[PDB]
Short mmCIF file of all heavy atoms in Angstrom, two decimals:
data_model
loop_
_atom_site.label_atom_id
_atom_site.label_comp_id
_atom_site.label_asym_id
_atom_site.label_seq_id
_atom_site.Cartn_x
_atom_site.Cartn_y
_atom_site.Cartn_z
N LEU X 97 20.50 -40.30 68.31
CA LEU X 97 20.41 -39.43 69.49
C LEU X 97 21.72 -39.53 70.26
O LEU X 97 21.97 -40.55 70.95
CB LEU X 97 19.22 -39.83 70.37
CG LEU X 97 19.11 -39.07 71.70
CD1 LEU X 97 18.91 -37.56 71.44
CD2 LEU X 97 17.97 -39.64 72.52
N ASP X 98 22.59 -38.52 70.13
CA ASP X 98 23.87 -38.47 70.82
C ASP X 98 24.70 -39.70 70.47
O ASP X 98 25.40 -40.23 71.31
CB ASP X 98 23.71 -38.36 72.32
CG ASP X 98 23.24 -36.92 72.71
OD1 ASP X 98 23.54 -35.98 71.97
OD2 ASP X 98 22.59 -36.81 73.75
N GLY X 99 24.59 -40.16 69.21
CA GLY X 99 25.29 -41.35 68.79
C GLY X 99 24.62 -42.66 69.14
O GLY X 99 25.10 -43.70 68.78
N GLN X 100 23.47 -42.60 69.83
CA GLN X 100 22.76 -43.81 70.23
C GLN X 100 21.36 -43.84 69.58
O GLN X 100 20.65 -42.82 69.56
CB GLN X 100 22.64 -43.87 71.74
CG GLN X 100 23.87 -44.40 72.44
CD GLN X 100 25.07 -43.48 72.30
OE1 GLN X 100 26.15 -43.87 71.88
NE2 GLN X 100 24.90 -42.21 72.66
N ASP X 101 21.01 -45.02 69.06
CA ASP X 101 19.65 -45.21 68.51
C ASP X 101 18.63 -45.24 69.59
O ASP X 101 18.90 -45.56 70.75
CB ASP X 101 19.66 -46.49 67.66
CG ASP X 101 19.54 -47.75 68.49
OD1 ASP X 101 18.53 -47.97 69.17
OD2 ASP X 101 20.53 -48.53 68.46
N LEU X 102 17.35 -44.99 69.21
CA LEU X 102 16.25 -45.01 70.13
C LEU X 102 15.51 -46.34 70.12
O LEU X 102 14.47 -46.51 70.77
CB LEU X 102 15.26 -43.90 69.86
CG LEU X 102 14.69 -43.74 68.46
CD1 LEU X 102 13.46 -44.61 68.21
CD2 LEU X 102 14.30 -42.28 68.25
N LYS X 103 16.03 -47.33 69.39
CA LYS X 103 15.43 -48.66 69.37
C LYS X 103 15.77 -49.49 70.61
O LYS X 103 15.30 -50.61 70.76
CB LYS X 103 15.88 -49.43 68.10
CG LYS X 103 15.42 -48.79 66.81
CD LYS X 103 13.91 -48.82 66.69
CE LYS X 103 13.40 -50.27 66.51
NZ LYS X 103 13.86 -50.87 65.23
N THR X 104 16.60 -48.93 71.52
CA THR X 104 16.97 -49.64 72.77
C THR X 104 16.83 -48.76 73.99
O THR X 104 16.84 -49.31 75.09
CB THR X 104 18.41 -50.12 72.69
OG1 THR X 104 18.71 -50.90 73.85
CG2 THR X 104 19.39 -48.96 72.58
N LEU X 105 16.63 -47.45 73.86
CA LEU X 105 16.49 -46.58 74.98
C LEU X 105 15.11 -46.76 75.65
O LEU X 105 14.16 -47.25 75.05
CB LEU X 105 16.66 -45.13 74.60
CG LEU X 105 18.02 -44.73 74.00
CD1 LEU X 105 17.95 -43.30 73.44
CD2 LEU X 105 19.14 -44.84 75.00
N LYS X 106 15.03 -46.39 76.92
CA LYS X 106 13.74 -46.35 77.62
C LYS X 106 12.76 -45.43 76.90
O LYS X 106 13.11 -44.28 76.58
CB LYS X 106 13.94 -45.88 79.06
CG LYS X 106 12.86 -46.34 80.01
CD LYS X 106 12.76 -47.83 80.14
CE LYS X 106 11.99 -48.19 81.40
NZ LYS X 106 11.32 -49.51 81.33
N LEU X 107 11.57 -45.93 76.62
CA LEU X 107 10.56 -45.07 76.02
C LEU X 107 10.06 -44.03 77.00
O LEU X 107 9.89 -42.87 76.61
CB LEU X 107 9.37 -45.92 75.54
CG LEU X 107 8.24 -45.12 74.84
CD1 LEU X 107 8.79 -44.40 73.64
CD2 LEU X 107 7.10 -46.04 74.45
N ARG X 108 9.86 -44.39 78.28
CA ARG X 108 9.41 -43.42 79.27
C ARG X 108 10.44 -42.35 79.48
O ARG X 108 10.10 -41.16 79.59
CB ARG X 108 9.04 -44.11 80.56
CG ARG X 108 10.08 -44.19 81.64
CD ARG X 108 9.60 -44.94 82.85
NE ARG X 108 8.45 -44.31 83.46
CZ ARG X 108 8.49 -43.51 84.51
NH1 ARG X 108 9.63 -43.21 85.11
NH2 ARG X 108 7.36 -42.98 84.98
N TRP X 109 11.71 -42.70 79.54
CA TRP X 109 12.76 -41.67 79.69
C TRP X 109 12.91 -40.82 78.44
O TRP X 109 13.11 -39.63 78.57
CB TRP X 109 14.11 -42.32 80.05
CG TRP X 109 15.22 -41.34 79.97
CD1 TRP X 109 15.32 -40.18 80.68
CD2 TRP X 109 16.38 -41.42 79.16
NE1 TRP X 109 16.48 -39.54 80.37
CE2 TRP X 109 17.16 -40.29 79.42
CE3 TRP X 109 16.85 -42.35 78.21
CZ2 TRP X 109 18.37 -40.05 78.78
CZ3 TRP X 109 18.07 -42.10 77.58
CH2 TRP X 109 18.80 -40.94 77.87
N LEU X 110 12.78 -41.42 77.27
CA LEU X 110 12.92 -40.68 76.03
C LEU X 110 11.79 -39.63 75.93
O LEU X 110 12.01 -38.49 75.57
CB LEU X 110 12.91 -41.58 74.82
CG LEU X 110 12.44 -41.04 73.49
CD1 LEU X 110 13.40 -39.96 73.00
CD2 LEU X 110 12.30 -42.13 72.46
N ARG X 111 10.55 -40.07 76.22
CA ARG X 111 9.41 -39.15 76.22
C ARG X 111 9.51 -38.14 77.37
O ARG X 111 8.92 -37.05 77.26
CB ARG X 111 8.11 -39.88 76.26
CG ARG X 111 7.82 -40.69 75.02
CD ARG X 111 6.47 -41.32 75.07
NE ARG X 111 6.16 -42.05 73.85
CZ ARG X 111 5.01 -42.70 73.64
NH1 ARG X 111 4.05 -42.72 74.55
NH2 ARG X 111 4.81 -43.35 72.51
N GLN X 112 10.19 -38.48 78.44
CA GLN X 112 10.33 -37.52 79.58
C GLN X 112 11.24 -36.35 79.22
O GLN X 112 11.13 -35.29 79.87
CB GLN X 112 10.87 -38.28 80.81
CG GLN X 112 10.78 -37.47 82.08
CD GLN X 112 11.29 -38.28 83.27
OE1 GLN X 112 11.74 -39.39 83.12
NE2 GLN X 112 11.26 -37.64 84.46
N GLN X 113 12.06 -36.48 78.19
CA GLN X 113 12.99 -35.43 77.79
C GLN X 113 12.53 -34.65 76.57
O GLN X 113 13.29 -33.82 76.06
CB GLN X 113 14.37 -36.00 77.58
CG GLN X 113 15.10 -36.40 78.85
CD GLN X 113 15.42 -35.24 79.74
OE1 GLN X 113 15.82 -34.16 79.25
NE2 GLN X 113 15.21 -35.39 81.04
N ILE X 114 11.33 -34.89 76.09
CA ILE X 114 10.80 -34.17 74.92
C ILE X 114 9.48 -33.54 75.32
O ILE X 114 8.52 -34.26 75.72
CB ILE X 114 10.62 -35.09 73.71
CG1 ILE X 114 11.89 -35.86 73.39
CG2 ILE X 114 10.20 -34.29 72.50
CD1 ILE X 114 11.76 -36.86 72.26
N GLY X 115 9.39 -32.22 75.18
CA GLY X 115 8.17 -31.52 75.47
C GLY X 115 7.42 -31.16 74.24
O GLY X 115 7.90 -30.36 73.43
N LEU X 116 6.20 -31.69 74.07
CA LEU X 116 5.41 -31.47 72.89
C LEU X 116 4.30 -30.43 73.17
O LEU X 116 3.58 -30.52 74.18
CB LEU X 116 4.75 -32.78 72.43
CG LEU X 116 3.91 -32.68 71.17
CD1 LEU X 116 4.81 -32.39 69.95
CD2 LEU X 116 3.12 -33.96 70.93
N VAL X 117 4.21 -29.44 72.30
CA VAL X 117 3.14 -28.44 72.34
C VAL X 117 2.31 -28.60 71.10
O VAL X 117 2.73 -28.32 70.00
CB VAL X 117 3.69 -27.02 72.43
CG1 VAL X 117 2.55 -26.01 72.39
CG2 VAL X 117 4.50 -26.87 73.72
N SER X 118 1.04 -29.09 71.26
CA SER X 118 0.21 -29.41 70.13
C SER X 118 -0.32 -28.10 69.53
O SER X 118 -0.34 -27.05 70.13
CB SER X 118 -0.94 -30.31 70.60
OG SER X 118 -1.52 -29.84 71.79
N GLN X 119 -0.75 -28.23 68.26
CA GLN X 119 -1.33 -27.09 67.55
C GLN X 119 -2.68 -26.72 68.15
O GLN X 119 -3.05 -25.57 68.21
CB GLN X 119 -1.45 -27.39 66.04
CG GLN X 119 -2.22 -28.66 65.64
CD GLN X 119 -1.76 -29.91 66.31
OE1 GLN X 119 -0.62 -30.30 66.20
NE2 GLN X 119 -2.67 -30.55 67.03
N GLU X 120 -3.41 -27.73 68.61
CA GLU X 120 -4.71 -27.56 69.24
C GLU X 120 -4.56 -27.90 70.73
O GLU X 120 -4.18 -29.04 71.05
CB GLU X 120 -5.77 -28.42 68.60
CG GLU X 120 -7.08 -28.56 69.37
CD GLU X 120 -8.28 -28.48 68.47
OE1 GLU X 120 -8.49 -27.44 67.84
OE2 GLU X 120 -9.04 -29.49 68.42
N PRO X 121 -4.86 -27.00 71.63
CA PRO X 121 -4.68 -27.26 73.05
C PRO X 121 -5.59 -28.39 73.55
O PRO X 121 -6.75 -28.53 73.13
CB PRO X 121 -5.04 -25.92 73.73
CG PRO X 121 -5.98 -25.28 72.75
CD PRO X 121 -5.50 -25.68 71.39
N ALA X 122 -5.04 -29.23 74.44
CA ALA X 122 -5.78 -30.36 75.00
C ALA X 122 -5.81 -30.21 76.53
O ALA X 122 -4.75 -30.25 77.18
CB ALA X 122 -5.10 -31.69 74.60
N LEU X 123 -6.97 -30.01 77.07
CA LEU X 123 -7.16 -29.86 78.53
C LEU X 123 -8.19 -30.86 79.03
O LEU X 123 -9.29 -30.95 78.49
CB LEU X 123 -7.64 -28.42 78.86
CG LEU X 123 -6.46 -27.50 79.29
CD1 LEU X 123 -6.93 -26.09 79.44
CD2 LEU X 123 -5.88 -28.02 80.59
N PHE X 124 -7.83 -31.60 80.05
CA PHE X 124 -8.69 -32.58 80.67
C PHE X 124 -9.56 -31.95 81.74
O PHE X 124 -9.19 -30.95 82.37
CB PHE X 124 -7.87 -33.73 81.24
CG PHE X 124 -6.87 -34.30 80.30
CD1 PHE X 124 -5.52 -33.97 80.40
CD2 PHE X 124 -7.25 -35.15 79.29
CE1 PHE X 124 -4.59 -34.49 79.48
CE2 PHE X 124 -6.33 -35.66 78.39
CZ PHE X 124 -5.01 -35.34 78.52
N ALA X 125 -10.71 -32.57 81.97
CA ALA X 125 -11.71 -32.02 82.88
C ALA X 125 -11.29 -32.29 84.35
O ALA X 125 -11.80 -33.16 85.04
CB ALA X 125 -13.08 -32.63 82.61
N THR X 126 -10.33 -31.49 84.79
CA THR X 126 -9.86 -31.55 86.17
C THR X 126 -9.43 -30.11 86.58
O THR X 126 -9.56 -29.19 85.77
CB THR X 126 -8.71 -32.60 86.25
OG1 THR X 126 -9.19 -33.84 85.73
CG2 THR X 126 -8.28 -32.83 87.69
N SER X 127 -8.94 -29.96 87.75
CA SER X 127 -8.52 -28.64 88.25
C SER X 127 -7.33 -28.16 87.44
O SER X 127 -6.61 -28.92 86.77
CB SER X 127 -8.20 -28.73 89.73
OG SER X 127 -7.05 -29.54 89.98
N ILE X 128 -7.08 -26.85 87.54
CA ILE X 128 -5.94 -26.23 86.87
C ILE X 128 -4.65 -26.49 87.62
O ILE X 128 -3.54 -26.33 87.11
CB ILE X 128 -6.18 -24.73 86.63
CG1 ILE X 128 -7.42 -24.51 85.77
CG2 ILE X 128 -5.03 -24.06 85.94
CD1 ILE X 128 -8.22 -23.33 86.10
N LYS X 129 -4.75 -26.94 88.87
CA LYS X 129 -3.60 -27.34 89.66
C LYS X 129 -3.15 -28.75 89.34
O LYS X 129 -2.06 -29.15 89.73
CB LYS X 129 -3.93 -27.23 91.17
CG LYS X 129 -2.78 -27.53 92.09
CD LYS X 129 -3.24 -27.51 93.51
CE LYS X 129 -2.07 -27.52 94.50
NZ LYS X 129 -1.19 -28.71 94.29
N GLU X 130 -3.95 -29.53 88.57
CA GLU X 130 -3.56 -30.81 88.07
C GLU X 130 -3.30 -30.83 86.55
O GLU X 130 -2.41 -31.56 86.10
CB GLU X 130 -4.61 -31.89 88.38
CG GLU X 130 -4.96 -32.00 89.86
CD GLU X 130 -3.81 -32.47 90.71
OE1 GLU X 130 -2.98 -33.25 90.20
OE2 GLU X 130 -3.72 -32.04 91.90
N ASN X 131 -4.06 -30.07 85.77
CA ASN X 131 -3.84 -30.00 84.34
C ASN X 131 -2.50 -29.39 84.04
O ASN X 131 -1.95 -29.64 82.96
CB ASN X 131 -4.92 -29.15 83.68
CG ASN X 131 -6.12 -29.97 83.30
OD1 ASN X 131 -6.01 -31.08 82.78
ND2 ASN X 131 -7.33 -29.42 83.57
N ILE X 132 -1.94 -28.54 84.91
CA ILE X 132 -0.56 -28.11 84.78
C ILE X 132 0.41 -29.02 85.50
O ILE X 132 1.62 -28.97 85.24
CB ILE X 132 -0.42 -26.67 85.28
CG1 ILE X 132 0.91 -26.06 84.81
CG2 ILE X 132 -0.44 -26.64 86.82
CD1 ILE X 132 1.27 -24.76 85.53
N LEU X 133 -0.10 -29.90 86.39
CA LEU X 133 0.73 -30.82 87.14
C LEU X 133 1.15 -32.05 86.33
O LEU X 133 2.15 -32.69 86.71
CB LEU X 133 -0.02 -31.24 88.43
CG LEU X 133 0.60 -31.82 89.68
CD1 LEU X 133 1.16 -33.23 89.51
CD2 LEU X 133 1.66 -30.87 90.21
N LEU X 134 0.47 -32.36 85.20
CA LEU X 134 0.82 -33.53 84.43
C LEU X 134 2.25 -33.52 83.92
O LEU X 134 2.81 -34.59 83.64
CB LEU X 134 -0.15 -33.67 83.27
CG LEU X 134 -1.56 -34.13 83.53
CD1 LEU X 134 -2.38 -34.09 82.26
CD2 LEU X 134 -1.58 -35.54 84.10
N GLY X 135 2.85 -32.35 83.81
CA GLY X 135 4.19 -32.27 83.23
C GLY X 135 5.23 -33.02 84.07
O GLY X 135 6.05 -33.77 83.54
N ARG X 136 5.17 -32.86 85.38
CA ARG X 136 6.15 -33.50 86.24
C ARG X 136 5.55 -33.65 87.67
O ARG X 136 5.62 -32.72 88.46
CB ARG X 136 7.42 -32.68 86.29
CG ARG X 136 8.62 -33.40 86.91
CD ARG X 136 9.81 -32.48 87.00
NE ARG X 136 9.55 -31.34 87.82
CZ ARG X 136 10.31 -30.23 87.87
NH1 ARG X 136 11.36 -30.11 87.09
NH2 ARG X 136 9.98 -29.25 88.71
N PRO X 137 4.96 -34.80 88.01
CA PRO X 137 4.26 -34.94 89.27
C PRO X 137 5.16 -34.96 90.50
O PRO X 137 5.11 -35.91 91.30
CB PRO X 137 3.51 -36.28 89.13
CG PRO X 137 3.53 -36.56 87.64
CD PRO X 137 4.82 -36.03 87.16
N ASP X 138 5.99 -33.94 90.65
CA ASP X 138 6.87 -33.85 91.85
C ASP X 138 6.93 -32.44 92.40
O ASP X 138 7.40 -32.32 93.54
CB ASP X 138 8.26 -34.34 91.53
CG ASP X 138 8.94 -33.53 90.45
OD1 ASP X 138 8.31 -32.62 89.87
OD2 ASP X 138 10.14 -33.78 90.15
N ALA X 139 6.50 -31.42 91.72
CA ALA X 139 6.72 -30.04 92.13
C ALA X 139 5.76 -29.68 93.27
O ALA X 139 4.80 -30.38 93.56
CB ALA X 139 6.57 -29.09 90.94
N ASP X 140 6.01 -28.52 93.85
CA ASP X 140 5.19 -27.96 94.93
C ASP X 140 4.37 -26.80 94.43
O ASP X 140 4.34 -26.48 93.26
CB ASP X 140 6.10 -27.56 96.11
CG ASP X 140 7.23 -26.62 95.65
OD1 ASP X 140 7.37 -26.42 94.46
OD2 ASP X 140 7.93 -26.08 96.54
N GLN X 141 3.64 -26.18 95.34
CA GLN X 141 2.74 -25.07 95.00
C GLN X 141 3.51 -23.84 94.49
O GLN X 141 3.04 -23.17 93.60
CB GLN X 141 1.88 -24.69 96.20
CG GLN X 141 0.62 -23.93 95.84
CD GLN X 141 -0.29 -24.69 94.92
OE1 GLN X 141 -0.34 -25.91 94.95
NE2 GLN X 141 -1.01 -23.96 94.06
#
């Protein structure tokens, strides 16, 4: 990864920069204002 291995990078940061779209959609039993909020818990309305 950019000349650097992932055996030493932050796992949370590495996963924060990869967006996965599953073949089968996964939705948790909560509001649609939170099921879309899981991506980045900092945005506004």
